Amino acid sequence: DHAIYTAMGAASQTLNQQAVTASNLANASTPGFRAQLNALRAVPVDGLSLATRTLVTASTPGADMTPGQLDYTSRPLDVALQQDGWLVVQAADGAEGYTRNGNIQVGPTGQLTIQGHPVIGEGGPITVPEGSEITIAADGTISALNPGDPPNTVAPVGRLKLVKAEGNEVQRSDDGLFRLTAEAQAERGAVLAADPSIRIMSGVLEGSNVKPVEAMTDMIANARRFEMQMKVITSVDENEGRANQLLSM
Amino acid sequence: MISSLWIAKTGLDAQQTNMDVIANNLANVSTNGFKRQRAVFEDLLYQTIRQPGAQSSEQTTLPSGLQIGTGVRPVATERLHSQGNLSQTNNSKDVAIKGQGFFQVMLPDGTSAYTRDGSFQVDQNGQLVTAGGFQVQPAITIPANALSITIGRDGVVSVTQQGQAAPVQVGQLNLTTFMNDTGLESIGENLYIETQSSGAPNESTPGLNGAGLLYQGYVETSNVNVAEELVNMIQVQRAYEINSKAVSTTDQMLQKLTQL
Amino acid sequence: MISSLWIAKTGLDAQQTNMDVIANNLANVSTNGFKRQRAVFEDLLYQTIRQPGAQSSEQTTLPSGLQIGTGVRPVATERLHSQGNLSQTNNSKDVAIKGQGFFQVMLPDGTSAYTRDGSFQVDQNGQLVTAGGFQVQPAITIPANALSITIGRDGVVSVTQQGQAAPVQVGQLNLTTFMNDTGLESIGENLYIETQSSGAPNESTPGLNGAGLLYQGYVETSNVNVAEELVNMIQVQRAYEINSKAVSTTDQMLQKLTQL
Amino acid sequence: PSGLQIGTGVRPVATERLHSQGNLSQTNNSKDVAIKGQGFFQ
Numbered sequence: 001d002h003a004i005y006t007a008m009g010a011a012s013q014t015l016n017q018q019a020v021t022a023s024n025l026a027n028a029s030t031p032g033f034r035a036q037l038n039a040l041r042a043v044p045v046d047g048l049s050l051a052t053r054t055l056v057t058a059s060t061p062g063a064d065m066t067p068g069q070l071d072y073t074s075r076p077l078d079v080a081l082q083q084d085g086w087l088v089v090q091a092a093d094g095a096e097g098y099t100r101n102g103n104i105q106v107g108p109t110g111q112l113t114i115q116g117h118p119v120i121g122e123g124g125p126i127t128v129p130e131g132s133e134i135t136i137a138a139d140g141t142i143s144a145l146n147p148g149d150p151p152n153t154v155a156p157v158g159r160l161k162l163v164k165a166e167g168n169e170v171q172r173s174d175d176g177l178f179r180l181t182a183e184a185q186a187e188r189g190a191v192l193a194a195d196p197s198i199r200i201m202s203g204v205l206e207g208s209n210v211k212p213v214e215a216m217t218d219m220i221a222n223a224r225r226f227e228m229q230m231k232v233i234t235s236v237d238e239n240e241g242r243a244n245q246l247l248s249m
Numbered sequence: 250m251i252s253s254l255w256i257a258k259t260g261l262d263a264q265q266t267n268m269d270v271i272a273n274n275l276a277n278v279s280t281n282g283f284k285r286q287r288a289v290f291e292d293l294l295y296q297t298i299r300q301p302g303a304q305s306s307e308q309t310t311l312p313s314g315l316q317i318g319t320g321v322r323p324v325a326t327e328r329l330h331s332q333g334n335l336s337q338t339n340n341s342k343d344v345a346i347k348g349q350g351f352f353q354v355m356l357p358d359g360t361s362a363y364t365r366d367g368s369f370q371v372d373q374n375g376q377l378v379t380a381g382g383f384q385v386q387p388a389i390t391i392p393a394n395a396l397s398i399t400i401g402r403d404g405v406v407s408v409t410q411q412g413q414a415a416p417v418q419v420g421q422l423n424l425t426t427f428m429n430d431t432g433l434e435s436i437g438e439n440l441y442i443e444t445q446s447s448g449a450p451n452e453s454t455p456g457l458n459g460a461g462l463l464y465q466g467y468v469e470t471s472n473v474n475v476a477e478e479l480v481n482m483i484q485v486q487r488a489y490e491i492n493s494k495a496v497s498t499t500d501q502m503l504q505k506l507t508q509l
Numbered sequence: 510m511i512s513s514l515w516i517a518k519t520g521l522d523a524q525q526t527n528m529d530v531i532a533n534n535l536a537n538v539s540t541n542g543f544k545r546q547r548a549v550f551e552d553l554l555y556q557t558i559r560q561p562g563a564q565s566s567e568q569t570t571l572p573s574g575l576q577i578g579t580g581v582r583p584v585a586t587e588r589l590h591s592q593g594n595l596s597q598t599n600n601s602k603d604v605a606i607k608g609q610g611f612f613q614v615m616l617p618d619g620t621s622a623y624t625r626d627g628s629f630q631v632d633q634n635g636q637l638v639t640a641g642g643f644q645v646q647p648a649i650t651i652p653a654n655a656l657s658i659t660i661g662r663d664g665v666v667s668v669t670q671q672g673q674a675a676p677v678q679v680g681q682l683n684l685t686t687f688m689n690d691t692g693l694e695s696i697g698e699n700l701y702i703e704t705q706s707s708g709a710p711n712e713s714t715p716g717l718n719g720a721g722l723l724y725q726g727y728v729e730t731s732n733v734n735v736a737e738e739l740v741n742m743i744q745v746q747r748a749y750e751i752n753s754k755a756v757s758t759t760d761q762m763l764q765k766l767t768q769l
Numbered sequence: 770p771s772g773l774q775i776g777t778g779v780r781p782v783a784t785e786r787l788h789s790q791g792n793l794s795q796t797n798n799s800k801d802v803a804i805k806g807q808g809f810f811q
Contacts, residue, residue, distance in 0.1 A: 022252075061313050073329075233509070533776045
């Protein structure tokens with residue numbers, strides 16, 4: 001009779017997987033989006049005799065740090081990181097989140113702001129002169145040429161800090177921004193170094209790594225598993241109902 | 250209603266918004282001075298359900314926690330201000346811009362808008378207007394019997410009279426530059442109005458203080474890259490089909506749930 | 510999810526990766542020195558389920574055991590290093606390679622990359638660069654007011670000056686060869702970095718110790734055979750459709766199974 | 770080999786001008802001049 005619960009669990013948790021895939025799948029064409037891969041965990045129910053039941057709890061082990069594929073836009077300050085690279089960004093609460101969105105923007109007052117909550121590099125938020133005409137180099141240096149000055153005045157105005165971290169040592173933080181896992185904090189510290197070997201691809205953006213192929217069979221298997229759970233539930237309740245005649249008379 | 254249905258719904262709406270952007274972008278080829286518009290999306294706040302445990306590292310273990318998340322809300326429609334090509338109209342009153350800058354224009358309701366469009370004319374009174382009667386600022390009034398008009402490379406507009414061997418300097422057609430060009434509020438009719446995201450407008454003569462120069466007889470073209478739009482259309486169509494499949498899968502699962 | 514679904518999705522992954530290889534290899538026609546890539550796949554291990562019995566040879570008996578196996582993981586992406594055709598660029602500071610060899614370039618971070626590309630220039634200080642300013646090691650510093658630059662077949666680069674009847678030898682442009690050209694780890698920007706599969710770089714003047722000569726005024730073109738890419742594209746599309754049919758057949762099997 | 774690569778894109782890096790000597794065309798104009806060898810008029 002308690003079998004139904006286990007089956008229920010599976011059904012319920014499968015819906016959660018569906019949910020993940022859906023959010024994983026609507027976010028195609030979202031810049032620099034990291035697909036949230038998902039798994040199902042068996043959960044044994046260690047008890048006093050005959051360990052027979054296991055639950056099907058749903059989980060998201062992390063994000064897929066597979067570089068999405070690049071779109072060439074020729075915009076001077078659209079940035080693409082190399083593999084395992086991250087742009088550091090001052091989060092809403094204030095802490096160094098990490099993103100792959102290189103769609104940098106400038107405000108009227110010269111705040112470099114990957115979609116606002118600005119970008120962090122070599123100091124606080126990067127600031128540039130208001131008539132920016134920004135150019136971003138390969139290693140991260142940012143040079144600015146005021147529009148009405150001779151072009152041999154492109155002296156660098158800042159540097160864009162980049163950080164190397166991937167997969168096991170990075171987790172999403174309830175915003176599009178990633179942080180370290182607090183297991184990679186009794187390690188390379190709270191604030192990472194600049195790692196002067198991560199390169200920048202200028203004029204090119206990165207799209208989401210939402211693999212449609214594995215998502216489509218994610219959904220196919222999810223549907224099939226769900227209706228298998230429904231069959232188990234149906235048989236269990238019919239068993240119990242037809243059983244209930246024992247106690248009468 | 251469960252989260253899967255509405256998440257796939259917001260995916261479908263985002264693809265629809267992207268297609269609206271592309272269709273507008275493609276209709277406005279052959280609109281002088283038009284700037285292509287790019288839709289930028291974003292994910293929504295992830296509803297965490299179970300925080301991850303500790304990586305005991307005794308055995309290689311999956312870092313399983315659980316956060317589901319939702320949504321692909323459109324966060325921006327940027328305007329790419331790159332210089333478009335020029336077309337020769339042989340029209341003396343036409344004008345194109347070399348580099349950053351906009352023409353300031355007085356709207357009927359009294360506010361000042363700004364346009365990167367040069368298809369000028371003259372009203373019956375002689376004032377410079379923009380294909381729609383919007384006065385160009387500061388007002389430039391042409392005498393009645395000008396043989397020819399000339400707008401120089403810094404906007405010094407002058408006319409030639411019958412008899413004078415000298416083009417009386419009749420006005421100055423100065424430009425206006427913004428700190429953040431992309432932030433302008435496009436109100437249609439090829440006009441933008443300045444907002445808090447663009448800063449106050451800085452007015453100056455063309456060629457000075459970062460403003461561009463003026464090309465008489467030429468008009469700027471829309472900088473729409475149709476290859477980008479076609480490939481984006483293919484992307485949008487297939488993403489739409491994928492999200493439609495997601496909705497269908499969730500609906501079928503819900504049917505199977507509600508049979509029993 | 511049953512094994513058939515995951516095996517067919519490995520197949521679809523493989524065809525998608527092959528299409529990415531083809532698309533990259535295709536888009537880089539008119540890229541100087543580019544070397545075509547070929548995707549090489551490998552099957553994954555076979556799980557024996559029921560070992561074959563004894564072939565008693567009393568009769569012709571089918572040798573039936575049962576091993577299923579799985580997957581098509583991509584095992585390599587071989588860079589087909591061959592001498593591409595030459596195209597004349599008429600640029601004095603340009604050069605292609607006759608045979609194997611790589612120009613050594615000092616990366617911004619300090620290490621050395623290697624490029625098969627002669628789109629060279631001179632920066633403001635006379636140093637040779639590679640279309641992006643990366644210095645060509647060892648540095649070759651062209652004098653300020655040279656009349657002409659000559660790079661000989663063995664890299665001896667000289668300049669002609671106003672008045673002297675002698676091409677003063679201003680530098681040497683030596684090549685680098687590897688014992689396994691295919692193993693170089695490509696990093697983008699037409700650059701390869703040496704890895705354990707290529708061995709140490711061996712430096713030498715062109716034409717000696719197996720290094721190829723130098724041809725000035727010419728650029729090596731990509732050795733991409735577009736007919737091969739088109740035929741591979743047809744094959745990839747058909748294989749993708751077949752694998753999708755495998756997924757669909759398994760899925761309708763599963764639908765019927767879960768009906769009852 | 771400890772990995773493979775897929776790669777993407779063919780981004781343009783530069784447009785280099787060819788600063789060679791052009792031919793000379795006679796304009797029969799006293800004012801007009803042309804340049805042998807390199808150099809620019811300020």
